Design a protein around this nucleic acid. Structure first.
Ligand SMILES: [Ca+2]
Ligand SMILES: [Ca+2]
Ligand SMILES: [Ca+2]
Ligand SMILES: [Ca+2]
Lengths: 312, 312
DNA sequence: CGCTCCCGGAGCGT
DNA sequence: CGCTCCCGGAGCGT
């Protein structure tokens, strides 16, 4: 097999970038910055399978990809990850008095990783003939540093430099300026854990605010640079409706609840890989403002287009 | 049985408060404000049995309660919660291809509630014959309302007012001034979810800051009211070291890692219910300043004393 | 029904 | 090893 790089020693992206990330998800070759995905092959193939048929039915790839992105939850629910993992990991509890198992650990991790893998793969495909607007899992080295706050912490005589790298699960960014970027935080479910996305959104704002940085003893490399860095959330909202005594989803309902709304309110945008929901917008316009606390995931192609001035 | 109140209709706490809290947890009588705890009996008895033995051994009761507080993780690990719940709840996966069971859900909820239940019970004991310094689960009605931010969120011609009630798992407060209080957030495990505590810590800071309030368009009843409200965190850090391929604890180690430090650095104090950890301080003086990022939980006796000017 | 609980290693990054 | 992933109802409060 072969193994390549995505970035050089100065942090610059190599040429033909997107095809390298897509080839990595395809298990075509290795990469310095990413391990092969452990359990991505089945669900990736089904994504392709679903979208090779659609575009064969005449439909333009752009539309097929918008629709697919907005249906990733169906895709994830259709993949029996449990059965695939069972042949490898112990289904019995890690501890004598515990409830988690290696299998449930693997399941939890992999379904989360596959959610991100999926929309990294999708964006890679829709951008595979563009070398101006790149997409990668995690953050490109320049944006990671830029999005890293520093907090000097003195306790008595002890001094501790605390490093605070603001979270991004994946990123689409400008080659000529990696700060010109859409930073995406993803979670397969919201619940109160959505709150985690919210401190990062809070830190993202703070990195731009000189008063706030001074208040908390925070330092940034540059607040100006981050002006073009947008911070969004994407979710699959996967609560299986057919659960015994299921209490329902956090987005697929008539209107999102109060404390769900607030987490969404501190992000620039929030997406759900679902399509039939009333309060969820299917239309996105950066210029005339946020249409709704929630957008269909397919709308991310629209802000990619509107921000970086391209067509897909 | 008999059923009583913790707060009068105006919000003021009834006399002889703290033994109404202890009796509720003893399931001597009912309360308006709290359901009786679902499965606290077994571990509550072990707590009592443990300190009566330590006291009978000749140890001063203050020293005994402090020691128990700093060993609550041992108590929780010694209670076979899973066995007690296996009679009632079903171990099969909630969903065909899922990984969670109604039993596991019960385990997770109840082990979290018991951790809080424990140190509420402990503090109610420690404060048995004090009616100026009170302890309750959750927040007293006036501190609760005082810690509730609001956010006007206009999208387009919609408008929704967003409530943001800053979290407290349990609270120790002055009868004469409920905003003279220690608010405590608790978690059995840290991991990355400690991050949730951190946004709430940020919100509690924000509620005292006019610039920050205005920045994110937030309203509070009174910033100056919260000047004596302190915001701390307590953790049991229960990662069982006997789990196969265990990665160990977040505070029981030579040095808390960077991002665990970060979360801790945004709280006034962080406690662990473990003793004998090198970096974890066993001394607490408000006057001379935070001794370290982490304290033994028994040191909460010490800040209660210093802050409210009482002897326990 | 709103909101919160999480007896934790797998997996990936450095 | 640092940090993050979580096919979600039970339980408590209202
Ligand atoms: Ca994420
Ligand atoms: Ca009295
Ligand atoms: Ca009795
Ligand atoms: Ca808590």
């Amino acid at each position: 097999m072969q193994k390549y790089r995505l970035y050089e020693k100065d942090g610059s992206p190599v040429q033909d970038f997107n095809r390298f990330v897509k080839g990595w998800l395809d298990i075509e070759f290795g990469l310095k910055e990413h391990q092969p995905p452990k359990v991505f092959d089945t669900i990736r193939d089904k994504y392709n399978e679903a979208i090779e048929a659609v575009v064969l039915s005449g439909v333009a790839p752009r539309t097929a990809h918008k629709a697919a992105l907005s249906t990733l939850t169906e895709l994830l629910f259709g993949h029996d990850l449990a059965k695939e993992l069972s042949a490898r990991l112990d289904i019995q509890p890690i501890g004598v008095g515990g409830f988690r198992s290696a299998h449930s650990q693997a399941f939890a991790k992999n379904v989360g990783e596959n959610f991100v893998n999926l929309m990294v793969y999708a964006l890679a495909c829709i951008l595979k003939d563009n070398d101006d607007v790149l997409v990668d899992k995690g953050l490109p080295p320049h944006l990671k540093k830029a999005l890293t706050l520093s907090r000097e912490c003195r306790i008595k005589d002890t001094l501790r430099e605390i490093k605070i790298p603001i979270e991004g699960d994946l990123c689409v960014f400008s080659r000529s300026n990696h700060c010109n970027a859409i930073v995406i935080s993803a979670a397969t479910r919201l619940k109160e854990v959505f709150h985690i996305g919210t401190m990062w959104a809070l830190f993202s704002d703070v990195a731009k605010d000189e008063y706030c940085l001074n208040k908390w003893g925070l330092k940034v490399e540059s607040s100006e640079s981050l002006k073009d860095t947008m911070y969004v959330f994407a979710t699959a909202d996967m609560i299986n409706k057919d659960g015994a005594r299921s209490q329902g989803c956090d987005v697929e309902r008539e209107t999102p609840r109060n404390l769900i709304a607030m987490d969404a309110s501190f992000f620039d945008y929030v997406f759900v890989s679902k399509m039939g929901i009333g309060h969820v917008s299917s239309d996105l316009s950066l210029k005339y403002g946020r249409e709704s606390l929630f957008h269909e995931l397919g709308c991310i192609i629209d802000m990619i287009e509107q921000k970086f001035d391209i067509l897909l």
